[PDB]
Every structure is written in C-alpha cells, then in structure tokens.
Write a protein that binds this DNA or RNA. Structure first.
Lengths: 53, 240, 65, 167, 141, 83
RNA sequence: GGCGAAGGCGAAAACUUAGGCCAUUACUGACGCUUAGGCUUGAAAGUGUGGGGAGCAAAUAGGAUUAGAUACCCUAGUAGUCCACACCGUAAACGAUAGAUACUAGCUGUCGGGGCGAUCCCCUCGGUAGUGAAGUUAACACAUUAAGUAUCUCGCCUGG
C-alpha cells in the first residue's frame, strides 16, 4: 500500500487504510465459534447496508 | 357538457408503481412506465352517473361537506367553492370524533361561536398577549370547523380530495354504511367509494376537473351558481 | 457507474483483464463487492474466482497489495 | 477434455532457454502430443514463487480426459524453472448461446460507444432506452378448440353500486 | 381458444379442481380454468339444469393433447357470488356411498345435493322418487 | 463418462424415445454405473450412494409400472444389471 | 447471493460428479406422493490407531476476585486443532411450519435461464423476501417462496 504522497499528511491517509485493515482483521484475535463469526459478520453487513446506504 | 371528451386533459403520471390491483377491474391495463392511464370512456360515464346521483341527493335540501385537504390544490378549490357557496366547508382535515358522534363536535363548535362573539367583543377586557392568544385560538377553531358553525345535522353528502388521504373522514363515514363520492386512482381500492370515478390527481388538470364537476353536480340543487357543469369549453390551470 | 453486468463480457477469468483487476482491486488489497462495482451473481463469482486465482498466480499479491 | 498448460520459465531470462524448458515440459504428455507454442509475453509476479519476480508465459493446447493434469501440476511444482503450471480447460462457466454471440459485437459496441468524440455527448454508460425489438415471453406453444358450450352467459356485473337512490 | 399454457394436477382431477375452486372461493376470482374430466362436465351440466352456473366451456387440443374446462364464477350486479358455500363430500381417499334412503338436503334444505346412483349424477329429490341411491358427491349452497 | 444420450439413442427400441420408461431406466442404470466409479474414485461422497438409492428405488418402481400397466413392455428389458 | 438433504459449503489449480434454471411444438406416457419395512448421511463434542501438532485451549497447575472461584482476568499444559482411518448420531439438525402436492391480490425487488439492446431499462418461468389484500392465527403475523387452499401417505402429542 503506497503512502508516498506528501511530507506532512501521510499519516492522515494512513489512518483510513489502517481502519480498513483493522475492520477486515478484527475477528482473528480471539477464540470463537463459527456460528457467532457468521452471525456478527452478516449482521454487521446488513446493518451497514440499511443505515449508511 | 356532461360525459364529453372536451373536459378531460393531461391524465399522465401517477406514483411509482406502489398500488393494489383492484383498479384493474375497472381501468384499462396500467402503464408500467409509472404513468398509469385512465381510458376516458369509463371516466366520462362514471362522471355522468355520479353527477346525476349527487344532484338528486342534494336536491332534497341535504347538507353537503366540501372538504379537500391536499397540499394546496383541492384546498384552494374547496375554499373557492366555499366563498362561492353558502354550504358548510372545512379548510383543513379534522382530528377525531366528527362523524362518529356529534357530542365531540358540539362543545367545540359551541365554544367556536362563543369565541367568535368574544373576539367581536373582547378588545380591552383582557391583556394584550391574552387577546392575541384568543385570536390565534379562534383562528385554530375556525380552520377545523369553518362549516360546522353552519350546520347542526351531519352532512347527507360529502366529497374528499383522496379517500386514502383523509383517513379520519372515510373512517367516521364508514362507521355507518353511507353513500359517498370521491376521486380514486390506480393506487387505492374501489371499496372506498360507492360509485367510483377513477382518473388522475397528480397533474392538477384532472384534479380540478373532477373536483369542480363533483361540486357543480350538487351546485344546481339549491339554485346556486356554477362554473363547470355543462360548459363545452374548459380552462387549463396549474397547482394553485 | 456500475462496472460489471454493465460492461461485462460474461467471461472474466484471465483474458487480458490484468489492468482491470488492478483497478477493480484498489492497490490497498481489497476485492470490490457487488455493492460498488455492481457486478451480478455471475460476474461477481467469476471475478472472485479469477482474482483468487491471480492471487495463486502472484499477479496480485495475497496480502501485500 | 482438452486442457491448456500455462507454463513459466525462470524470471526474464533468454527466450531460447525458455523454449528449451518448454519443450522439455511438453515431452511428458500421455495422449497425442499435438500442441503449439503461444507466447503470452513476459508477465510479472508480485511475490516470489521460485525466486523469480517475473516469468515468460507460454500457452499449450493438449488433449486428454484426466491424464496429464495432476502429473504436470506436481512435476512443475517440483520443477525449479517453472513457477506456475496453470491447467485451464474449455470448462469455463458462461453462456455459449446464439443470443450472446452476435451480442459479442454488441459487447464491443459497449466499449466502442463507452467513448464518443462529439461537441455535445450523445451517449451515456447504461442509459435506459427501451430499444426492445422482439421477445419470447417463455411460453409453451399449445392451441385448443371449444368442444361444447352450454349456458354461455357471463353476467355483465354492473359498476360499483351500493345503497343507491336516497328516496 | 388460445391458452398456450399447461394445467397441472397432483395425480387426479379432484386435487387441482378443488384447489382452483377454493382459490376462487377465498381470493374472489371471476373465472377459473382447470383440467377436464367426466365429473366436472357432469356437475357443470347438472348445475346448469338446477340454475347455479355461469358460462363454461370444455376445451381440447386435438382429442387428448390437452383436455381442460373453463368456467366463470357467477356474481351479481353488486358482485355477490351465487354460491354460499361449496365443499366436496367425496374425496379420492374418502369415498362415501349412500342408498336413496339416506340422501339429505344441505344444512336444512338450502342447497342441492347431487347423487350418482346408477347411471350418472342426478338430484336427491327425484333420486328418492326413482328410489335409487349412490354417491353423494358434494354440498353446494 | 455420463453416457446418457449415446446409450439412449443406441438403445431406442421404439421409433424415437429419449424419455420412455425403457430408455429412462437404461439412463438410470448407466448413471449408477458412472456413480459407482464415482464412489470408487470418491469414497467420502456419500451423497452419491444416496442418489444411488434414490435412482434404484425410482427404477424399481418404474419396472413395477412397466410390468403392471403395459403387460409385456418389461419383456424386452435387458437392464437392471446383475445382482 | 448461489448451490447442497437438513446436516453445510469461499487461496487457488485440476480430477470425477450430480442436482438444477429457462425455453424442449417436444421424448415416453399416470412411472405421480407417501411412511411403518428396507435403504444412507447426520455438525461438533467425544472413542481409538499411527504419524503429526505451528497453534492454543476441557479437566488440571499457578496467579487474581472471592465467604470460596469449579468464575469473569491472565502464564502454561492434557486430550482437544491436522492428515487418513473407522466409530460417534445428538443439535437453535428450527419453515421453530413433514414430504410432495395445485393454483391464489398487489408490491419493490434480486438472481439464473429463454427471446432483446450497449451492458441497461422489456416480457416470461423458476431461485432468493417480506410490507399487505383475501384466507388462516391467542397476537405477532404466513401470505405468491403459506400458517390460504385441493390429494395421499406417514411420524409426532393429549397438563405437570
């Protein structure tokens, strides 16, 4: 992921890509079952589909 | 004239395909381009039948209620009718206990008359803010009961801007099983009026056509003036 | 503008679409869903298989970009 | 079932060595060895496979049922110079119908008309026009004829009519 | 006529017949079309004789390539159907045969009870006049 | 592989039939042969033996039909192979 | 969003493979569904063999709260995860709606299929849903993907 843009605002753009990386990787840091994994993922997806769009 | 093609004009465009199919019984196949059309032979025959029916009904010195509370169009139409007629009329849409009982209307209209007399009298008896308060509250009373102050018996006939729109009007009209005429579109069902006259209301051209025809059908009952009942020529007007 | 099922050739596996994949998948390593590019069930499944095969082709890195 | 070898050589080395490795790989067929060279050019590999960032892509057509797919896959995983050993096949799940074959030109007419140089642009990507000229309605052809019709009256139900004349 | 679409059943005309009949009963449909059989034609003709039916036609493709019967549901000028309840008494898995001594009316007498005694479907009162009994097919009132 | 239409056309005892009871049971039997070299090649695919039971029950029902409805339509049958 | 019998299925490559979606004028011809019999799977936990185990974690050890922690909290670890083998047979195996079955408002869709054009808006049939008519429910509500309504079969209950 290239971030060579400017000498002072690179971290500001780094924030959003870090947020995307987190939100795609926010489920592999603990033990859990498949059912709650699918439940949380699909519920968050259909909740974002209904409010922000 | 009556049941002649010269009246109807600009019957294009409805809501966005959100409706019930009961209209399909009495209307030609709807256009899928959101612009449902109403073949005018059925509209003209229904106009003739409804005109004769309500004329006969109102010839018996029955009471009529001219209430249409759409955005601005039918409101202005019924207000022009009211300033043209002596029959009762309501500028706005009421709230509850109007046709299901008269006790609720009784106190409201009695205090409306009392406050009319008060505003005719109260100019220095009270304070300035209290007087302005009474003026605004009598305006509020008159906007909902501008015709209730001219009748004791409930109207024997009425019209509505859209039966779905005035849910209270049709609800308390259907508390008893009574005849009614109205404007109905492809969206509603034919159980909301005992003699259906389906056409357009989205363009104002058809709305004013049907509304003035309905008003003028009962207009010539008590020897009262008329603008659109038998005129072969029509005037094109926009949302007012 | 919708990107597949809108200009889609119905056959998106490896046919000279490398630049499109590099634009369909932004250089920040994310496959676009049907929610943005608008690709249909057909187009989205074939794009998914093609992109994961390109991942298994090192044309697009698995985790880098 | 015919198959397609997408074959690779170490990095961007000389093309003669690439062809030699290609021939060496193509000597290991089981069925008839009718095959041709289709040089797909030099394409990059973003991450190393066998310590080569790029590779010369070659295409080979061969015929079998299930003979030389797994064997080639494994022997090219072992092979140092061959990074990827893609096995493609005519099994490619999309329409091969005659109602998309002329429309392939229309597919070109997509891109051809996705850009239009004119003073006032007359074209828009995916703009509804309803140019529909013909249809099928997915209907099953069947005819009939009336056999015997008795009591043929269907009452002409009147207009919506309840609680009429006030008198 | 031109239908250009097939009509399906479970394994016998009774199933889809009564399916469509009750579909018209609840959903208030003006006309119905189902497959053709002797029972439907006979009952339609007998209700024509008793005065209970709208228009009805039997349709064939050539001779058996598709046999169907279509019939309008008779309503009134105020759209009140002439039928005030229709229900089969005999079913494929429930067939009942009653002698002429055991042929009742509908509710009190409100409808016509049709019995196939020995040569076809015909009415209860004259069935007892002829003193021949059989299948009480259904109750219509 | 599948050997559905080739074995149908090869074994069309009537003038032209790709869905007669004869050719349908031959189709089912050829398909269970194909599914048997499936379960030899893919053992854990028990869905294949489930479909095997489904198709064999269907064909035995079809054979009972071929016996009772058309009294001698099952006489020319040479399928439902060795038990 | 699709498929798969629920069970479930997603780095790819390939292997074989079936169900299936539309149009089949058609290919036949009442085989159509049915469950007790009979025939298979059934998650995972767990059983056992051998490897193998990067990883963590039932029980357990210790540290923390505690009236104590078999708790929340943490550092290890046994099986537990993997591969193949067989077993395992219960599940929110929930349409909390048996199968198939025949059609039944609208509605916005959405996907696949068949005719169309630039993909698109178009018609149709099936897959993916409910707002809601009628019908059916104690009420929510099922409702064109029935709890509507025809046909058959079967299992499941008669209060604790």
């Amino acid at each position: 992921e290239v971030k060579n843009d400017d000498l002072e605002l690179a971290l500001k753009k780094f924030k959003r890509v870090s947020l995307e990386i987190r939100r795609l990787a926010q489920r592999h840091e603990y033990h859990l079952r498949k059912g709650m994994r699918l439940r949380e993922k699909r519920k968050i997806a259909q909740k974002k589909r209904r409010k922000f769009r | 004239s009556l049941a002649k093609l010269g009246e109807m004009r600009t019957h294009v465009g409805m809501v966005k395909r959100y409706w019930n199919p009961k209209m399909g019984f009495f209307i030609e196949p709807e256009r899928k381009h959101n612009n449902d059309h109403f073949v005018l032979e059925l509209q003209r025959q229904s106009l003739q039948t409804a005109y004769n029916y309500v004329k006969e009904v109102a010839q018996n010195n029955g009471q009529i209620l001219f209430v249409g509370t759409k955005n601005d169009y039918v409101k202005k139409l019924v207000n022009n009718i009211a300033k043209r007629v002596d029959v009762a009329f309501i500028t706005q849409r009421w709230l509850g206990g109007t046709l299901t009982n008269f006790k609720t209307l009784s106190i409201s209209i009695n205090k409306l008359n009392k406050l009319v007399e008060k505003q005719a009298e109260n100019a220095a008896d009270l304070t300035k803010k209290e007087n302005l308060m009474l003026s605004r509250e009598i305006e509020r009373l008159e906007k909902f009961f501008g015709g209730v102050k001219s009748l004791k018996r409930l109207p024997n006939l009425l019209i509505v801007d859209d039966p779905v729109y005035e849910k209270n009007a049709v609800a308390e009209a259907n508390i008893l099983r009574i005849p009614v005429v109205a404007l109905c579109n492809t969206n509603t069902n034919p159980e909301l009026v005992d003699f259906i006259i389906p056409a357009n209301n989205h363009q104002p051209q058809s709305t004013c056509l049907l509304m003035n025809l309905l008003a003028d059908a009962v207009a010539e009952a008590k020897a009262m003036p008329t603008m659109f009942a038998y005129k072969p020529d029509e005037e094109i007007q926009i949302e007012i | 503008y919708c990107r597949f099922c809108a200009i889609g050739q119905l056959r998106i596996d490896l046919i000279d679409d490398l630049e499109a994949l590099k634009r369909f998948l932004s250089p920040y390593a994310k496959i676009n869903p049907r929610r943005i590019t608008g690709n249909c069930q057909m187009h989205q499944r074939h794009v998914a298989k093609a992109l994961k095969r390109a991942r298994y082709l090192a044309l697009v890195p698995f985790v880098k970009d | 079932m015919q198959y397609n070898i997408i074959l690779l050589v170490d990095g961007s080395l000389s093309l003669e060595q690439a062809n030699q490795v290609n021939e060496k790989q193509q000597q290991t067929l089981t069925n008839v060895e009718g095959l041709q060279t289709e040089y797909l050019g030099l394409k990059e590999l973003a991450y190393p496979i066998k310590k080569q960032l790029s590779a010369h892509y070659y295409r080979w057509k061969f015929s079998g049922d299930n003979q030389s797919t797994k064997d080639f896959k494994r022997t090219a995983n072992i092979n140092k110079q061959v990074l990827r050993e893609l096995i493609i096949n005519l099994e490619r799940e999309y329409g091969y119908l005659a109602s998309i074959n002329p429309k392939k030109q229309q597919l070109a007419l997509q891109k051809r008309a996705k850009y239009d140089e004119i003073i006032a642009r007359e074209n828009n990507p995916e703009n509804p026009d309803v140019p529909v000229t013909s249809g099928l309605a997915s209907t099953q052809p069947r005819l009939s004829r009336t056999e015997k019709a008795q009591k043929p009256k269907e009452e002409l139900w009147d207009v919506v009519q309840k609680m009429g004349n006030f008198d | 006529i031109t239908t250009t679409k097939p009509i399906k059943a479970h394994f016998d005309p009774v199933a889809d017949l009564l399916t469509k009949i009750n579909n018209a009963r609840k959903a208030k449909l003006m006309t119905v079309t189902t497959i053709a059989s002797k029972l439907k034609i006979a009952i339609l003709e007998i209700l024509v004789k008793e005065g209970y039916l709208a228009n009805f036609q039997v349709l064939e493709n050539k001779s058996k390539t598709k046999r169907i019967v279509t019939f309008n549901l008779k309503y009134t000028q105020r759209r009140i159907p002439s039928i005030n309840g229709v229900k089969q008494i005999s079913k494929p898995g429930l067939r009942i045969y009653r002698p002429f001594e055991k042929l009742p009316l509908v509710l009190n007498g409100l409808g016509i009870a049709i019995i196939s005694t020995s040569d076809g479907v015909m009415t209860d009162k004259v069935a007892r006049l002829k003193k021949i009994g059989g299948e009480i097919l259904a109750y219509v009132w | 592989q599948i050997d559905k239409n080739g074995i149908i056309k090869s074994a069309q005892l009537h003038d032209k039939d790709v869905g007669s009871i004869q050719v349908q049971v031959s189709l089912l039997t050829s398909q269970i042969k194909q599914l048997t070299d499936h379960l030899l090649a893919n053992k854990k695919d028990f869905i294949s033996k489930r479909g095997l039971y489904a198709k064999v029950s269907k064909r035995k029902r079809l054979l009972k039909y071929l016996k009772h409805n058309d009294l001698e339509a099952y006489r020319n049958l040479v399928k439902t192979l060795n038990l």
